[PDB]
Scaffold this motif. Structure first.
Motif, short mmCIF file in Angstrom:
data_model
loop_
_atom_site.label_atom_id
_atom_site.label_comp_id
_atom_site.label_asym_id
_atom_site.label_seq_id
_atom_site.Cartn_x
_atom_site.Cartn_y
_atom_site.Cartn_z
N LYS A 1 -50.50 34.66 125.56
CA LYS A 1 -50.72 36.02 126.04
C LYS A 1 -49.42 36.81 126.10
O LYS A 1 -49.37 37.98 125.70
N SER A 2 -48.35 36.18 126.59
CA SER A 2 -47.10 36.90 126.78
C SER A 2 -46.54 37.41 125.47
O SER A 2 -46.07 38.55 125.38
N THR A 3 -46.56 36.58 124.42
CA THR A 3 -46.06 37.05 123.13
C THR A 3 -46.90 38.18 122.59
O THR A 3 -46.38 39.11 121.96
N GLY B 1 -41.22 36.48 135.63
CA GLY B 1 -40.01 37.02 135.04
C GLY B 1 -39.76 36.51 133.64
O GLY B 1 -38.65 36.09 133.33
N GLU B 2 -40.79 36.52 132.80
CA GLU B 2 -40.71 35.98 131.45
C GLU B 2 -40.57 37.06 130.39
O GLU B 2 -40.68 36.75 129.20
N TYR B 3 -40.34 38.31 130.77
CA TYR B 3 -40.13 39.38 129.81
C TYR B 3 -38.70 39.88 129.79
O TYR B 3 -38.30 40.54 128.82
N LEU C 1 -50.09 44.31 134.12
CA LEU C 1 -50.19 43.42 135.27
C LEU C 1 -50.32 41.99 134.78
O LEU C 1 -51.22 41.68 133.99
N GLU C 2 -49.43 41.12 135.25
CA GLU C 2 -49.33 39.75 134.79
C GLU C 2 -50.07 38.85 135.78
O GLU C 2 -49.86 38.96 136.99
N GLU C 3 -50.93 37.96 135.27
CA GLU C 3 -51.75 37.09 136.11
C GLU C 3 -52.63 37.91 137.06
O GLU C 3 -52.45 37.92 138.27
MG MG Z 1 -47.35 34.16 130.35
#
Ligand code: MG
Ligand code: AGS
Ligand code: AGS
Ligand code: MG
Lengths: 657, 602, 90
Positions: A159-161, A188-190, A435-437
């Motif tokens: 999802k993040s990519t 904090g993965e971006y 919005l993440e998660e």
């Molecule tokens: Mg992710």
């Protein structure tokens, strides 16, 4: 040839087909006869009716013929999607249905290009199609931003990519020089993907990364109560509210604000006021003692005078050490809110809450004067030079994350609502929120504040130009009413049997051909369904280039437990714990760092006998008791990752910055 | 005979097959051609489409054909799972789905290696696979630790031995010389597994064993009041807090500590302070070593606690006992070093000898001492960022209840929610999954499912699994003893392994009193006056590997396995030398010596 | 609901001992049309107030918010203090 046969059945908006001879392969590439997702053609007179397969095998045979013969497993089932006009375009909705015996031809590259292509200028490519090479997936940015979307899929589907690819695509200065985006990171993965094309705010700053600040005086009274005192209800709430109000009036007295007066000042208005003064003056009542019985005046403070007559513990307000009075008449003026005030004192102590009560530049002195106002805050958050603004919520305490999400969403929405006529509103430079998660805050019966703000944006965001993009790996947990109001979906791989059904239960264009292949989409595939696309796609999102990928710098135990143990002194750990600080006492003030895993710069020092090195991702280490002779040897040997990795790696007591 | 048949239905994610012939129980090992969970493969052109057997029998035939052929069932249903690369790797998801009439083969050893084997250095061996020969089960170690774990099953399933196996294989000095793991042993059985390779802390230490001491001043205000008094809420609480503050300020004025002054002093601060002085001063106002002298009842309660051998691990610490002047031989440095910095990787805080009433509030405290200590030193070489930690918890369903109002739930929830950043794991050994709070079990990364008899808990497990795969989860209540279904994100795909049991003699066994042994032996008259003289003062004072020697006290001394020391009294020393010279161990002692003379275990 | 009774045992408005500025005029007279609530000097507390403090705070907030001008301040049906309207429902 393309002629695959003819239709042997019709039920209005559905048809079946028979096989071609064994398998036939065309053009020599790696592909096969019409599969589940593949399209087919039906010419009629001058126009063509396009169809999509449904399933291949015993699932499409006419009932009674199969009754006649059981081995007759030679049929597929195809559903009509639309038509092409008289060389005008692909307009969904068929004007003239097919009949028995008519032709059916495979779909070639030009016809697929006509189906997916488009002449409108408001579309953009956000990936690529899987059936045929090099076909952009023309997603509609207008609709995608003004009608909300949602990325779903299991953990490893990526999802993040996908979100990174989409956001990189939108914010290109060649096409949209005036974008505006905000992101919420729960891990904090971006901050690593957008290396130098965004702003990153953190709880624990870095060398070139700003500090996240949410001054407590920007909140409403109710949210302030929620985050400070844990939701008071008794008359303590009323006493606290009156204290806040009076302090804000005192602030306004000595400062001039445009058009705000005692006839228009409400509690929820965002004006500075002191919190340390609040706690000090509230608590002083709870322990006040007057030198004379039957009196409740500050001048009567029964302070235990010292050797010189001055009280031993005068106390101090700016810091949070309260004084001690004589034993005991104790003044009966304060309320019974001693425990909430003790809790507030403890909160003030913690360095974990500095982003609220000790904002770097929005901290307020005793009389209320603040060095900077909120306009700079908003300018940094949303009016900055660079488009995408990233919030790192990894370091926040885990018990007030939901409230923080709610607070930020409320501030953004209200700020962009009231100025919708100026060129800085939402109707002139539209905004997007990520919005993440989202499954842990939009639960079906969540009692928090985030769901309220998200619902408000999803429901009113179309008029003031505020979009939303939900990311979640557990769709069965998101509230159904909210999930049904998202215009677009990017259904990725979905594993368990419950979320698959819950996703099917809120998708407008439930499409038999493509929704059955949900549980085995590769790492990157995404079936995009909604109004943002004319017809559902099956697109492989174009990966971002290496180095521009999302990553979280979590420890790797296998590479750390393997290193030979080094004798440790736990006096340092106890010292740090007691002092309540994460910085040792033997770090050098600074060291000039010169350019050359890898090592990108090595320092040195002679007086302090200290070495400082830097690695990738801004990892700075300081090693101790290393003779600078070893420094020059390391420089000369031209190792850069071997002499260090073999000589001083596990022989000297070190510390990160 | 790599061949089964021809796919006849293709639903995109649910293909079906028509088996062609006869099923043979291959001798030597016992692997049949095809099982319920057995993998299948389908070469398509140049690549391989792998699948899992989902259903076998009449449940897989295409529906309406039942009307065609009511009693003809020879079909199978295979759910296609992943795919192999072009001599590159195995990855999930399918680049291109199959059509009708393809070929369907059976999985062969090279495919076993390709699917199951891997090249990443993180993966390790935790037992070979079931239904096939010599395939180690590879579990990612980084993900397992930092993404949290869990164990579930039935009472006799054997989860303690699986946990013992994992801990043994995860701390060997060969590859992980600096490992670190903590186990909150409760029933007290692991301690027998790691004889001379782990540290064990009890409440009644043996000759070669340590004493668990948790100083009463390492607690916060709320925790200390909870443990001592039960959580007072009146003005008595205020009085006690003020007294604690005064004692701590006094001791700081007495002795110096690094960088702490009156300006930064709080109740939460972990510094020494004398409990006895507190009690004596708060009691004098209502009327030391010895406890002879509106919060009266609290002070009688605490006075009773002071002189109680049960509470000797709080108020009478071995060397953390604090003098009247707040002076102690050692600080918390030694405590932290022993708990987490010792020379032995694994440590076991077996809490069997604890007053159950406080057990929960005890667990939490430790979880708060560790985390809070590994958070404020996350940049030093002794924090969780540089040598991460794994916590184990046995019988978690009692403390992590959905509605429990204790403090352990808070600590465990905090480790689950916030342990990723600072490298802290968690391992919940449990027995009744439905009890555990559904919000916490949904944040555990990997799951080691085992036998589960209750139908009311299988449903919970199935509904709370990330990859609700059914080919491997329709067989929950029939797994063997040690047969484990591994499902999560710590493994590339679901596994169905058997855990290599630990070698004999290295296993957990809580030394329960075997009623058969203690009731078969002949009755011997008891000296109940000894029982009374021992209770008044509230005090406790097969194979043979050694025998004690003494000829002056008329006594004999023997040692059995497990470090059992027996002293036999009123034994003439002539019989002592007779036994020593007899060279008959286990037989002569059996002959006329088991039940002839008095003996008191020490 | 928020008042000060100067006389203990009495709650009549005549006992309204609100703090008044030393100038002679009250510091905060207050007005009905505006939602400004008068302040009162510290004290007894009027005994005729119910537990509707928070609900009235909410109503005050709604009245002060322009987004509800269509409901509480209708353009031509706005009601004065005396119950008057320029145009009926006709
Ligand atoms: Mg992710
Ligand atoms: N286009 C891609 N192709 C192959 N692998 C990808 C791709 N995108 C992401 N990944 C893989 O996923 C890793 C990064 O983590 P992601 O899986 O993308 O994030 P995510 O797990 O989907 O989001 P969370 O952690 O559930 S919030 C990458 O290192 C890849 O292994
Ligand atoms: N993999 C295994 N293979 C064969 N026997 C096993 C295995 N694991 C455990 N056992 C045996 O099965 C019996 C019970 O297993 P234990 O794990 O020791 O107890 P347990 O009941 O699982 O722990 P509790 O009481 O549920 S916390 C014992 O006789 C074990 O020796
Ligand atoms: Mg057990």
């Amino acid at each position: 040839s393309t002629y695959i046969g003819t239709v042997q059945d019709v039920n209005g908006a559905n048809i079946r087909v028979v096989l071609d001879s064994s398998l036939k392969f065309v053009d020599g590439q790696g592909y096969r006869i019409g599969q589940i997702g593949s399209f087919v053609r039906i010419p009629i007179g001058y126009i063509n009716l396009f169809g999509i397969v449904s399933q291949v095998g015993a699932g499409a045979v006419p009932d009674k013929l199969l009754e006649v013969e059981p081995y007759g497993h030679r049929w597929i089932s195809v559903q009509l999607v639309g038509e092409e006009g008289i060389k005008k375009e692909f307009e969904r909705g068929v004007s003239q249905y097919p009949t028995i015996g008519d032709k059916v031809h495979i779909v070639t590259e030009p016809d697929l290009k006509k189906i997916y292509g488009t002449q409108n200028k408001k579309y953009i490519s956000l990936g690529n199609i899987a059936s045929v090479d090099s076909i952009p997936a023309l997603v509609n940015i207008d609709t995608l931003v003004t009608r909300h979307s949602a990325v779903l899929g299991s953990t490893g589907s990526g999802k993040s990519t996908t979100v990174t690819s989409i956001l990189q695509r939108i914010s290109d200065m060649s096409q949209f020089p005036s974008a505006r985006i905000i992101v919420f990171d729960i891990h904090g993965e971006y901050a690593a993907a957008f290396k130098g094309k965004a702003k990153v705010y953190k709880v624990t700053p870095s060398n070139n990364e700003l500090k996240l600040s949410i001054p407590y005086w920007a909140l409403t009274c109710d949210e302030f109560l929620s985050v400070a005192f844990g939701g008071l209800e008794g008359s303590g709430r009323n006493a606290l509210i009156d204290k806040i109000y009076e302090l804000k009036l005192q602030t306004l007295k000595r400062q001039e604000y445009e058009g705000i007066n005692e006839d228009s000042l409400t509690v929820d208005t965002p004006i500075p006021f002191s919190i340390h003064k609040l706690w000090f003056d509230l608590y002083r009542a709870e322990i006040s003692t007057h030198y004379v019985q039957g009196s409740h005046s500050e001048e009567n403070e029964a302070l235990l005078l010292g050797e010189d007559g001055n009280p031993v513990q005068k106390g101090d307000s700016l810091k949070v050490v309260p004084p001690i009075y004589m034993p005991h008449y104790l003044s009966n003026r304060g309320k019974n809110i001693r425990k909430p005030l003790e809790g507030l004192a403890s909160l003030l102590k913690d360095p974990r809450y500095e982003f609220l009560f000790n904002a770097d530049d929005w901290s307020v002195n005793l009389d209320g004067k603040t060095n900077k106002d909120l306009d700079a805050l908003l300018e940094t958050w949303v009016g900055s030079e660079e488009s995408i603004s990233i919030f790192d919520l990894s370091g926040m305490p885990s018990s007030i994350l939901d409230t923080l999400i709610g607070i930020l969403i409320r501030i953004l929405y209200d700020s962009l609502f009231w100025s919708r006529n100026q060129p800085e509103g939402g109707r002139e430079r539209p905004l997007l929120v990520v919005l993440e998660e989202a499954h842990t805050y939009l639960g079906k019966d969540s009692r928090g504040i985030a769901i309220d703000g998200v619902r408000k944006i999803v429901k009113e965001g179309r008029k003031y130009g505020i979009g939303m993009m939900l990311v979640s790996q557990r769709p069965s947990e998101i509230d159904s009413t909210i999930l049904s109001q998202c215009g677009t979906l990017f259904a990725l791989r979905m594993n368990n049997s419950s979320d698959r059904n819950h996703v099917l239960g809120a998708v407008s264009d439930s499409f038999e051909g493509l929704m059955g292949m949900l549980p085995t989409l590769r790492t990157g595939e995404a079936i995009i369904i909604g109004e943002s696309v004319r017809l559902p796609m099956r697109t492989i999102i174009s990966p971002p280039p290496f180095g521009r990928r999302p990553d979280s710098l979590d420890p790797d135990v296998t590479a750390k437990w393997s290193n030979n143990r080094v004798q440790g002194d736990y006096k340092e750990v106890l010292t740090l714990w007691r002092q309540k600080k994460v910085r040792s006492q033997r770090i050098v003030e600074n060291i000039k760092r010169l350019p050359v895993s890898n090592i990108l710069s090595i320092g040195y020092e002679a007086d302090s006998m200290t070495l400082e090195i830097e690695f990738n991702h801004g990892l700075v280490y300081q090693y101790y008791d290393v003779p600078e002779t070893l420094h020059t040897e390391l420089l000369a040997a031209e190792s850069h990752g071997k002499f260090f990795n073999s000589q001083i790696k596990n022989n000297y007591r070190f510390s990160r910055i």
